[PDB]
Design a protein around this nucleic acid. Sequence first.
DNA 1: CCGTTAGTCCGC
DNA 2: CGGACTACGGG
Length: 184
Amino acid sequence: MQRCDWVSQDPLYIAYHDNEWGVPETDSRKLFEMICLEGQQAGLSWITVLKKRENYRACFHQFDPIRIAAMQEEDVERLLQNTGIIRHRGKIQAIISNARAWLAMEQNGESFADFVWSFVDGQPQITQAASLDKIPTSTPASDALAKALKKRGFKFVGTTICYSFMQACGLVNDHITGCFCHPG
DNA sequence: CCGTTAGTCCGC
DNA sequence: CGGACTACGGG
Ligand SMILES: Cn1cnc(N)c2ncnc1-2
Ligand code: NA
Ligand SMILES: [Zn+2]
């Protein structure tokens, strides 16, 4: 089975690639979880975060924004000691900030899913790249999404993070042409 | 440019 | 073994 260049031999990474990455996600809560996990990747490899994803789901209340938004300074200082996540105060606080930011949107008219999908025009763009070096790391759309998220109070959401989120949640489909998951 | 994680790599 | 190095926040 030929797969994208970034997939290691780790079966956890293989299942994530085959079953989740690039598959259009339209659920607001799932999208919220993914923008949070992409921010947790900053400066690190994605596999580090993926391997910890079950720990994140346990520590952050299955990414239910109401439960997250109720977390306090004491929770942050507790999580800073938890070796199952990334022990970085700014990143832990970012998940809490992001949950409050999502609530401020959703209690006030704006679907997070409608909002992120507004940065793509119709069907997800399918890459024409045969190799990872020909796939962009950010685009005009990811630039726009990052700027809009920051305006709305989100943290750890720059253009490169936003583009990786777009790939992951299938707002673009960046499976290389030779990958068995490419919609060839 | 400087600071940071977790993890890899490299030199002593 | 300890240090360098490695997409944000910062100055
Ligand atoms: C290589 N890769 C695969 N999947 C994700 N969700 C990523 N975020 C950053 N880098 C990523
Ligand atoms: Na759209
Ligand atoms: Zn692929």
